[PDB]
Structures are given as C-alpha cells and as structure tokens.
Write a structure and sequence with these properties.
- The structure is a homotrimer.
- Chain A folds into 2 domains: 2-67; 114-328 and 340-521, no CATH class.
- Chain A has helices at residues 2-13, 15-40, 42-67, 69-113, 116-133, 143-161, 164-191, 200-222, 224-239, 244-253, 274-285, 290-299, 303-324, 337-379, 387-394, 396-402, 409-421, 424-440, 455-464, 471-484, 489-492, 496-517.
- The first copy, chain A, has 521 residues and is mostly helical.
- The complex binds 1-palmitoyl-2-oleoyl-sn-glycero-3-phosphocholine and N-hydroxy-5'-O-(2-methylpropanoyl)cytidine (3 copies).
- Chain A: Its main location: membrane.
Chain lengths: 521, 533, 533
C-alpha cells in the first residue's frame, strides 16, 4: 500500500484546501437547488428562498461583527458615556412620560369601553401589590424586569387582539410546533401498536419527551442551540434584566410543554441559581402545550383568546418570578452524531419512568385528601364539601377583581377551582359546556342555579385557565427536574410550591389585562 | 425597608411565644370543631370522637412516662429484687402451673373440638422438634425466646380468633386498609387512561406498590410509623428477650416489605452479629408487606386471618430464628442506638414523597419481569411433564399433580384433614416455587367455588375445600419466602452493608427455611384454635 | 450432640461415594423409564429413545476422548510429521487440485443454473477484493482463515440447500423453536391481561426476549450451551486456525445475542489484542439471537434459510474480521483458559433464572426507546424530503425512494436480477439505518403478497418479487448491524472492560462494516446455490 500512503500524504498536504473545496461544493449544490426551485416556481419555492436568505444574512452579520468589533465598539463608546452622564435627570423624564402615557390610555381607551375595565386595571394593581407583599426578599427587588414584563405583555396583547397580521404569525408558529410533535406521535404509534390512543398519556405524551430529548441532544452537539441561546440572551438582556437561560425557557414554553421545555437548557441546569430555577419552574407552570391547544380549540374555546393567553403568559411568568423570588445571589461530550442521538434516547428512558411514577403518587395523594374532606363534610351534613367548593367560595373576590361581574364570579371561581385541583382539561370541558348552553339559549336561572354566563366572563375564564398549574403538574415537574439534574434535588423541591403559586398569579394577571382590553360584542 | 426589618426582628424576639400561642389556638380550634360535630349528631361523629380521645390519651401517656421514668423504675425495683431472690424455688412452681394449665386447656378444648385439633398440636410439636434437631449450634440454645414466642402467638390467636369483638375489630382494620389503598386508581386511571382495567395487573396492582411506598416514606419522615414500631418492638423485647436491633426489625416487618425493612437500622447494619443478621432476614421472609394486604383482601381472602397471620408471624420469625441459629457472641448495638430512627435525607414533605415514588420504580420493574419469566417457565414445565406422562398412558401428569403428593405431609401435619390436604399441598407448592400472589389467586378461586355452591365432587375431582382448610391455608401462605425472591433480597441487603457481603450469602438459604417453618407454626396454631364446620 | 458430630464426620468421609451412588441411582431410574416407554409402545417412545441414544453416545465419546487423548496424539504425530515433510512440494499440488475442482464445479453446475448465479459468484469475489483493499494492514494479511471460512460456508450451504434431509432437519428445528417461544408468548398474558395482542410489539415481542434470557441463563448454569459452544469452536479452530477467544465468541453467537456473548470470555476481555477485540465486535454484529428466531419465522420467513444464515454467519464473520483487521501482535490468552467458561454463580437453578430475568430489563428498555426515537426521526426526514421535492414537481421523493437507488449495486452484485434489485435495496437500507425487525416485516409483507397471488405489476410499481430474491434477502438481512446498535454494543463492552475503552471506540465502525460485508457474503454464497423458480 505504498500508493495508498502516498495518496494519504498528498491529501494531508492539501487537507485544509480539500475540506474548503468540498464544503464549497456542498454550498454550491444547495444554492443551485434553491435557484432551480425559484426558477421553476418562485411562489412555490418562496419559503426555501426566505430561509436561505435569513441564514446567509445571519452568517454574514456574525462574521462582520466578529471582524469589525473594535471599530464598532470604539464608535459606540462615546454614546454610552454621554448616556451615563445624562441619566440622572433623564430617568425622571422617562418615568414621567410613561405615567403620562398610561393616564392618557386610561382616559381615552378604557373609559370609553365601560366601567368594568377600570375594575380590571384595579385588579392588576392589586395583584402586583400582593405579589410584592409576599415576595421571598421584599427588599432585594429589581423593578425593571417587572415593569418591562407588564408593558411587553400589554403590547403583545394589543398586537394580537387588535391587528390581524400579528395573529397570523403566531398561528403559523403554533401550527409548525404541532406538526413537529406529530412525528413522535407516529413513532409511538408504531412501537405501541395502532391502538396506542387508548392510553393517551402513557403512550402519546411521553414519546414526545423521548423525541424532543433526542433532537435537543443532536442540536446541542451541532452547536445551533447555543447560537440561539446567545442571540436570545443578548436581546433580552438589552430589553430586560432577565438572564439568557430563563429567557430562552420562557420563550420556549409558549408553544412547548412543561416537561419538554427544560430540555432546551438541560446542560446548564446544574449551574443555575435558585432564582433562575424558580423562574424555569414558574414559566413551565403558566403555559399550555400545543396538542392540548388543538384539543381546546376543538372543544369550542376561542382560538384567538387561547393564542393570546399563551403568548402573554411568558412575559407575565418572567415578571412574576422576578418579583416573587428575586435573585440575591450572583449568577453561576458526544464524539459523533449517533452518540448524540443514543444519549438522548437513554436520558429519556430515565426521565419517563421518573415522571410517570411521581405523577401516579401525587394524584393518589390528592384524591385521598379530597375523600377525607368529603368524609368530614359528611359528618357535618355537607358531604359535597371538597377542594372545588372551597375554591368556589374562596376565589370569588379574586375573580371579581379580574374583571368578571359579580353575578358570574361564582362560576369563574368554580372553574378556577377545577383547573387548580384538576387538570385544566376538565376545566375547559366545563367552560365549553357553558358556552354551548349560552349559544343554545334558555333561562339564565332555572330555579336558583345559573345555567350560563355572559360572553365577557367566558373570555376572562378562557384567559385564566390557560396553564398547567395543578398538582399532577407538580409531580411531573419535580420528577423530570430531579431526573435531569439530580445534584439540585434538594433545591428543586424547595421552590416548587412558590413556583406553582407564581404560575397561578401569572395566569390571573394575563386575565386581568385581557379584561382591561376586551369588550362584549 | 427598615420598617420590615424591624418588624421581622420584633417577631423573632417573641417568635417562640407567638408561634406556640398560634399553634395552640389552631389545636383548640380543631378541638372545638370536633366538639361541635359531636354535639350536632354524636352517632355520625363517633369515629372522630374516638380518634381524638385515643390520640389525647396516648400523648398524655407518653408524656407522663417520659416525665417520671426514674420514679417508676424506683417503685418497680423492690419487686424485681424480691422476685430474683425467690426465683430459685419459684421457677419450678411457675413451670408446673404452666404445664398443668396447658394440659387442661389442650384436653378440654381440643378434645371437645375433635381429632384434627390434636393433630395440629402434634404438628406444632413436630415442627419445633425438627427445627431444634437441624440447628446450627444445638448445644448453645436459649429456650426462653422460643417459649415466649409460642405463648404470644397462642395469646394473640385466643384473643382474636376465639373472641368476637377482636374478630370484628381486625376485620374492620382490614377493610380500612383496603379502602385506603384503593385510592391509587385515581392516578392509575389518569396516567393509563380509563381503559386501564383492560390490563388489570399492570395498571392496577403495580401502582398500589408505588402509592404505598410514597405513603410509608411520608409517614417515616413525619414520625408516626416509628412510634408504633417502637411500642411493638418494646413489647417483644421485654417479653421474649431478643436483641434490640432484631426486635425493631421484626416489629417493623409486620407492615413493611422485606426489601425496605432493614433501612430502619441501616446505620448499624455492618455491626450486627451473624445471629442478628439471620434473624433480620428471617423476619423479612416470614411476613408480608402492607401493600399486598389490600390486593389479597380484594380477591376475597379473609382480612382478619391476613392481619392475624402477619401479627403472629412476627414473633414466629423471631422465635424460630433463635431456635434455629442461636447467638453465640456478644451483641454490639445498644438499645438507645437501635430504637432511635433518623430520616435519611428529607428536609420537607415533597422530598419524602419523591424519594418513595422513585424507589417504587425498580421495585415494580423487577416484580413484573420476574413474573413474566417464571410463568413462562411454569407453562413450559407443565407442557413437558404432560408430554412425558403421555408415554405411560397418563397424559394428565402436571406440576400440580406432583406438588400435591410432594407436600402432602406438611399440609396433613398443619391440621388439615386427610382429603383436603392435597389441595392445600398444591397451594403450598405454588407459593414455594412461585411467589404467593399466584397461590392466593388459586385460593380465591377455591373460595369462590365454595361460596357459589354446587357439587363438591364434579365427577371424581374435588372442586372446593372446607372453610377451616381455607383459614389454615390463609395462615400458611402469608409470607414472602420464595426461591425466586432469594436473589433480589440478598442483593438488596448487600447494597445496604457491602462490608457484610460474605456473611449475607452464608445465611441466605437457611433464613428461607426458617421463614417457611414460622409460617407453618402460625398455621398450626390457627388450625388448633379454629373449630371444624 | 457428640453422636451428631460423629455421624456428620462419617458422612463427610463417604460423601463422594454417596454422591456417586445418588447419580448412579438417578441414571438407572432414567434408563428404566426409557425402557418402560420403549416396551409399552416403541412408536410413542421413539423420540425419547433417540434422545437417550444420542446422549449416551456423546457421553461415551467425551469420556473416551478425555481419557485417551495422549495415545491419539501419539498415533497422529507421525502422519502430521510426514505431511509436513512433504508439504514443500505437496502444497502446490493440493492448491492446483482445489482450483481445478472449483473451476470444474463452476462450469458443470453454475453455468447450467443460469447467469444470475455466475453474477453471484462474481459478487462474492468483488466483496472479498473490496474488503481486502480497504484493510487496516493490507501487507500483513493471513490468507488461511479467509479461504477456510469461504470453504466452510460453501460446504455447509451445499449440504443444507442441495440435500433434502438436511433441508428437512433445519425446518424441524425452526418449528421447535417456534413452539418454545410460543410458550413465552402465552405466559405474558397473565401480566398484561388477555388483551396483550392489542399492543403487539411491546407486549409480545419483548416478553420473548425476557423468556429467552431466562432460559439462556438457566442453560449456562447447567452447562449444556457451554458443551455445544466448545464443540463448534473446536471445529472452527482446528480448520481455520483463529485464536481461542475469538473462535469461542464467534461460535457462541449463533444462538446468543451480541450484548451477552462476550460474557463467555468476560474475565479475559482486558487482555485481548486489538484484532481479537475487532473479531469479537464483528461476530457480534453479523449474527442474530435465538429469541428473535421465533418471531421472524412467524412472519412467514423461511426457517431453513434463517437457521442456515445464522450458522453460516460465524465463519464469514471470522474470515472478514481477519481480512479487514489482520493481527499484528502475539495473543496472550491460553486455549485452556479461553475454552473454560465459568458456570453461573447462582446457588440454584431458580436463582440463575431470576438473574437472567433481572438482566433483561435494560435491554428491553433501550430497544423500545431507540425504536421510538429513530422512527420519529424517520417520519421527520420523510416529511422534509417530500416538502423539498414538491418544489421540483416530484413530491413522491422520500427516504425509500433514495435508498432504492443508493443500495442498488450491492443488491445486484449479490445475485438478484435487475428488476428486483431495487426492492432488496430498500430492504437493505431499512435494515442498515433501522433494525432488522422492520426490514423483515417488509419482507414478510412482500412474501404474503406473492403467496396470495394477483398481478405482478398493478401499476408502474411492482408488488412482489421472485422466490430466489426472497431467499437472498433472507440471507442478507440476518444480522444485528445497525447505526442505532453501534452505541449499545460499545456501552456494554466498555462496562465489561473499562480499561479497553479507548480501544473499543476505535474499532466499532469498522466492525459494523465488517459485519454487513459478512452478511453480504453469506447472501452471495446462498444465491450461488439456489436455482431460479
Ligand atoms: C414597552 C414597554 C415599556 C417598557 C418601559 C418600562 C419602564 C422601565 C423603567 C426602568 O426602570 O428601566 C430603566 C430605563 O429603561 C429604559 O431603558 C427606557 C424605557 C422607556 C422606553 C420604552 C419604549 C433602566 O433601568 P436601570 O439601567 O437598571 O437603571
Ligand atoms: C391528561 C391528558 C389527556 C391532558 O391533556 O390533560 C392535561 C394535563 O395533562 C398534563 N400534560 C398534558 C400535555 C403535555 N404536553 O403536550 N404535558 C403535560 O404535562 C398536564 O398535567 C395537564 O394538566
Ligand atoms: C405484584 C405484587 C403484588 C406481587 O405479586 O408480589 C410478589 C413479590 O413481590 C415482592 N414484594 C412485593 C411488595 C413489597 N412491598 O409492598 N415488597 C416485596 O418485596 C415480594 O418479594 C414477592 O415475592
Ligand atoms: C424487538 C426486538 C426483538 C428486535 O427486533 O431487536 C432489534 C435490535 O435490538 C438489539 N438486540 C436485540 C436482541 C438481543 N438478544 O436477544 N440483543 C440485541 O442487542 C439489536 O441491536 C437489534 O438491532
């Protein structure tokens, strides 16, 4: 094999140039594919052209910023110095302008809609105050994230509710995510037989976790996910104090489940601070997944309201995490692709078992609590006593503060009780039943039991229920997070209940703002 | 800012008094609620009133006993001194009186009942004698634990089986255990859908283990379980005279599985002697766990007999271990060290729940895989036996036919009559080679056949057996001693104390036989007390 | 006490005689049973008489070989010496005669069979040359194991395929294995209910794995599989001349999986050379286990071809390993040490069964989860490919429409005709990227389509392929070489021998390619001997 050795030496002589040539050949082939697709039919080939243009623009921008960083920094430094010099009096001007804008908005927009929106605004203020009062570290609170989150959720709500173009983009993104999950559905269909839909959770919801684990492992190996995390971290750090990890988690949870989303930042989980872990859990508890979203738009719940609530939850989750548990402490392996995929698979084999077992145990305990309450009520002539009715009676003032008129406070409180102590699936079933009763028509009160509730109360209830804040969710979150990062086990269980409460309050805040904006048609 | 800090400091200054007052106010409010419930309608509120009275009495009793232990010991000392002084001649009188009482009770009661009761008593004597003969150190035997264990079993059986209020009380306790464990379906149905019943075993029976493990972890963290364990262990320690560590483990094994029982004394596990380790393994084998009790009651097995079997099996295991592998060396664990139990790592409730749930994972996985393998082996064995027996004009030959003749003498000695001893032998064989779940399934089928009625002999094959034989079989099957389950238990124990690995395997096989003999002793006593239909 | 010790000592003195008497009595009883069965009805007792006769013959043969090995070696030595003396000129004559015989066979048989068989032989030559070229050490290649492996494969294929009694024997064995695993399929109904057929894969295919693992551990404890492995390994070692460890491993994979086969030489894994480690990996990747044999035969795959491929894969595996990665260092493992296989440490048979059952859990879990992930990725890939192809007015583009063209040359060289090479190419692609289960499923569907009948071409798409192509595809797919399994093998083997980790990851992909080439060689040899329908 003298010839083989000579050829190997020759290739090694021009190894870099050979690699550059082959990569250039592949790039030329991809560009030829794009150009041919455009030639045959441009409208048909438009998405591939747009994707290619965005990718090439990002590559060029990154290279240019890396090369010309010195000149850009030197040019920008004087502006930063000037801003630092004049901040002392400029902060007052900015705050005054913002207060003036809020006053104008209340005067011209909300006052015209009706009196019920001012109550929504009052509720918003009350909720913020209460969250600050019971915060873990009241003194060490950073108010910039909170105000930015409230303002951002307000703007996004106004961008999705008032304008159709804003609606279209988020609809498109949701469709893409659901289409993505359909693939794990197909794999599970093969492995568990065609009758896998008989056992929905066990044979459908967990294969999603397996597939997402696999893909995320591969994407961390390739290096795209770290680029995404860097870009998101930078933009969010300029716009808010939020750190990159929790910002990315919160953005991901908009369309991804609570159990899947922490896999976005799995490598960083051991080294996150307590506040960032609390923010991760809270962001998980205050959003719903994609498949459930499809099933809820199927039941008859409005699609626009579900989408608006899902999008608005993330800023609200971040603001409530930063207020409820501020950050006092200072922050802070795959040889090839097949290794990435296989390691993802194995991590999944651990995760799924832990999740399932914890969920079983927690639901059993909750049912026992409810049955002991029913027994105690039976001894008092009121066997109907349970968690749901205690919430139907306790939650009425909060429901009224959210904006729903007094008459409909009871039904909204009961729905929130079902949602908190039973998955929001049953809560949305009840809500759709009430919507159907209203649409069919009939007497408002049969004898003394109300049948349905106004349209506006239905919208508020739709906003309030959009979240995975239950105790089964508590179980699956604890199990999954302890499987992902065993080192932080003692820390994960510490902030679980506060995370759950923060998630529920985030849902209530989104509902408060939505009621501030929406009006009965 | 500063005001909040000042308020926090002021609260901390009076933190103890304020917290005590608030907790007392909450307790008083609960008491007022109970009082109001009783006033409104006493009959409905009777359970809550009884629970409150019992809890108050036990709290007061524990507090007083802690307060005046020295005075109690001082008052007791003169009596102990006098008894020690006069024991030299009083021991013979006590022994003679005990022998006379035994003879009188045996003659009158048993001879009135029939011959099967006398046969069961003879079987008890035979089992004890055989255990004594095949003992590790027959010369170095200490008979006091043996006699006291047999006496405690007899007293428990006489108090439950022969007294109606006790029978009703234990039946009620079993019903409550079943009802409590039935709540696992709330989670099983959610996780596995409403069709979870379609796969009965996998999506009903296994989740019960998960729920029980979580509940026991929570109770161990809180400290309710340790209270009962300490009390029963103290009773056994004072009566029989066993060592504190083995007494605590045997008392715990009543309602805790064999795998999780030694975790109570894990910190001191390396320092146990050989005899104590053998007793630990035996007490683990002889008794069943609390999780399986609900499932077995569901099949139709009597709850009173299950509960009585567990309670009587604890002292059975201890006495048989002391007779079978007597201790020949000085123990190294103090009573205070043994009794004290400290949570491994549970700062808050959620951590305890999560830890129990996580352990149930491996438990259930091993259980299911072993079941699959061993039932496949059973089917193959039956087919091969039938094929071999077809050669000799006997195609009915199977595993059951061999087992019925093999184990017949044990069933006959336990007190079962001649004709029914073969079916009990079949059950014993199923339990010995395969875990007791399948044996209990077969027993439930026989019980259902009896209850439904019909011909006792269809053509020439008996369909069901008497009620007394069913009670005896219930007692003789209440254990975890299996050939298949040996390996796992060894591994589990070896995980807790690797330093003792060489010792654990040495006494692993003999503990299984000791546990089976203990089960047979409990069954012998039950057969003696029960009366023929 | 003293009498008991004296009796124990006396029994210890005669312990060996007691064991010998017990074994003699058992043997006499078995012989008496066989005699009774034969005399009652020789027709019914034929199978048991045959089993007894073969068992006695093998026992006698083993005893004679063990006792008189020295005399046999003494007698054989002069002949070997004379052969070595004349070898200098005899080797040319033997080689020329062998080549002449090969040419005569080709001309007389293969040309008459048709052109496709000549193409199959050409493909055999092409595969051998291609493997030689891209070899780790082309200059240092030992050519004896290559020619001897090809010769043994040809001899075995000729014997089984071209002789009817041999063809019937392997069919009979396949049916017996079907029945043996059907026992497990029945035994899983208890755990997963009577509706386990609803979820075919998870609740039928995996219990087969568990039961096979249990049976394998049982047999390993007894010592039969070790006997068979020793005999086959000796047959291959006397001919080829490979090393002891690699011969034993490649001779014990015919029925053992890849993950568990190295346990045979687990103690010596850290001392194996790089070449022998590669041979172990290759023999792992080029054979299937016996657990999956039943399922594949049930789908409709021919049993004779499955068993013939399993048997032929081992010589091909070794020949390809020795061609691809020839040995350049002296092994340090003795033949006596390698052939020795330590029996299971299990105290009894049932402990071994439990150990195997507990071991199977990780294998089943990894299989399931890898299947889920990889099929999800396949669905995503197909969707993206169709989306891209829609832009060029070709939405039919997909993963299989690329595999058909990518792997076509390999199928064509194997001897398949032009028209049917694309379907075999799709099957090869499915087996390479995803496990052979899915490829065999597609093959079963095509065989069912052929058997049912109907139009050969319903449209411009072919429906089913010829019979000979089905046999060739049966041979080519009989392996465990997957991208998905490339990880698990490494993970297990590093667990067995951590010190060798750096070496294991070096020779994994080459081992996988060697396994695939071994499968293709078996397919070529099979296709050269199969006449067109
Ligand atoms: C849409 C949402 C409105 C977001 C503004 C909310 C007020 C934040 C005030 C604050 O403390 O941050 C300050 C000014 O924040 C700004 O950078 C200017 C914000 C006004 C421009 C909005 C268009 C900066 O916070 P700091 O550097 O920590 O001091
Ligand atoms: C029970 C099924 C049918 C259901 O949909 O009820 C909603 C509840 O099921 C959990 N859940 C659901 C979907 C998901 N990703 O798509 N992750 C989850 O955790 C979550 O607890 C929620 O409350
Ligand atoms: C499916 C279950 C109910 C069953 O059939 O049980 C048979 C085997 O399960 C072991 N087991 C069970 C429960 C437990 N704690 O609740 N500890 C144990 O060890 C025990 O060894 C026995 O042999
Ligand atoms: C569903 C099962 C039966 C199956 O089709 O298996 C596919 C993959 O599972 C690996 N496997 C399988 C069996 C075994 N011993 O019986 N050892 C293994 O490693 C092996 O990689 C193969 O590709």
């Amino acid at each position: 094999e003298r010839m083989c050795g000579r050829m190997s030496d020759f290739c090694r002589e021009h190894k870099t140039t050979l690699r550059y040539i082959i990569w250039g050949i592949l790039i030329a082939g991809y560009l030829a594919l794009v150009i041919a697709a455009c030639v045959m039919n441009f409208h048909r080939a438009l998405p591939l052209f747009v994707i290619t243009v965005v990718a090439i623009f990002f590559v060029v921008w990154d290279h240019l910023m890396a090369k010309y960083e010195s000149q850009i920094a030197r040019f920008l430094s004087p502006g930063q110095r000037l801003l630092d010099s004049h901040w002392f009096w400029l902060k007052w001007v900015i705050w005054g302008c913002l207060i003036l804008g809020v006053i104008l908005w209340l005067v011209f927009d909300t006052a015209k809609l009706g009196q019920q929106q001012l109550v929504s605004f009052g509720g918003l203020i009350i909720y913020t105050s209460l969250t600050f009062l019971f915060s873990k570290h009241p003194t060490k609170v950073y108010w910039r994230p909170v105000f930015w989150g409230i303002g951002l959720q307000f703007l996004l709500g106004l961008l999705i509710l008032r304008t159709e173009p804003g609606f279209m983009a988020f609809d498109w993104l949701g469709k893409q995510v659901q289409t993505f999950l359909g693939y794990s559905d197909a794999g599970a269909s093969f492995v568990f037989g065609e009758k896998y839909t008989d056992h929905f959770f066990a044979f459908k919801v967990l294969p999603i976790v397996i597939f997402f684990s696999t893909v995320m492992s591969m994407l961390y190996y390739l290096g795209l996910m770290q680029w995404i995390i860097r870009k998101v971290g930078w933009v969010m750090l300029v716009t808010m104090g939020t750190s990159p990890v929790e910002s990315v988690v919160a953005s991901g949870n908009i369309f991804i489940g609570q159990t899947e989303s922490p896999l976005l930042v799995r490598p960083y989980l051991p080294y996150v601070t307590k506040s960032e872990l609390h923010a991760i859990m809270t962001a998980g508890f205050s959003t719903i997944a994609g498949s459930v979203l499809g099933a809820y738009i199927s039941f008859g719940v409005s699609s626009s309201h579900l989408l608006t609530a899902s999008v608005m939850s993330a800023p609200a989750a971040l603001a409530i995490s930063k207020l409820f548990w501020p950050e006092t402490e200072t922050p802070k392996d795959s040889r090839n692709l097949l290794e990435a995929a296989t390691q993802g698979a194995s991590s999944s084999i651990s995760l799924v078992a832990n999740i399932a077992v914890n969920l079983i145990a927690f639901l059993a305990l909750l049912s026992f609590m409810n049955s002991a309450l029913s027994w105690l009520g039976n001894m008092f002539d009121y066997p109907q006593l349970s968690f749901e009715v205690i919430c139907s009676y306790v939650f009425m003032p909060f429901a009224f503060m959210m904006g729903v008129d007094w008459q409909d406070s009871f039904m909204v409180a009961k729905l929130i009780g079902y949602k908190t102590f039973f998955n929001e699936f049953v809560a949305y079933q009840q809500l759709s039943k009430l919507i159907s009763l209203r649409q069919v028509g009939g007497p408002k009160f049969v004898d003394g039991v109300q049948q349905y509730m106004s349209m506006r109360s239905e919208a508020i209830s739709t906003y309030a229920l959009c979240g995975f804040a239950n105790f089964g969710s508590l179980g699956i979150v604890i199990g999954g997070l302890t499987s992902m990062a065993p080192s932080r086990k003692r820390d994960i269980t510490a902030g679980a209940m506060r995370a759950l409460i923060a998630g529920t309050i985030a849902c209530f805040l989104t509902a408060c703002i939505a009621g501030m904006l929406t009006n009965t048609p």
